[PDB]
């Protein structure tokens, strides 16, 4: 598949980091 959708991931930059930190916040909370 082409690069036509690999621009919105960059476009939505904060919305990815805020969905990864919330995963570490439950991963470390699981430990």
């Amino acid at each position: 598949d082409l690069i036509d959708l690999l621009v919105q991931l960059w476009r939505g930059k904060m919305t990815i980091i805020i969905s990864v930190i919330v995963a570490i916040a439950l991963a470390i909370g699981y430990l």
């Binding site: 082409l2 690069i3 036509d4 621009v7």
Partner: protein, 33 residues
């Protein structure tokens, strides 16, 4: 082993470079058609 660790470094260094020379061109082809 000194032999395979450089053959698998040139071929690794080329494939990461081929993504750069295609990445700086296809993104230039995609922006402002």
């Amino acid at each position: 082993k000194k032999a395979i660790t450089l053959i698998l470094a040139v071929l690794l260094g080329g494939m990461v470079g081929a993504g750069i020379v295609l990445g700086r061109n296809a993104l230039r082809n995609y922006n402002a058609k």
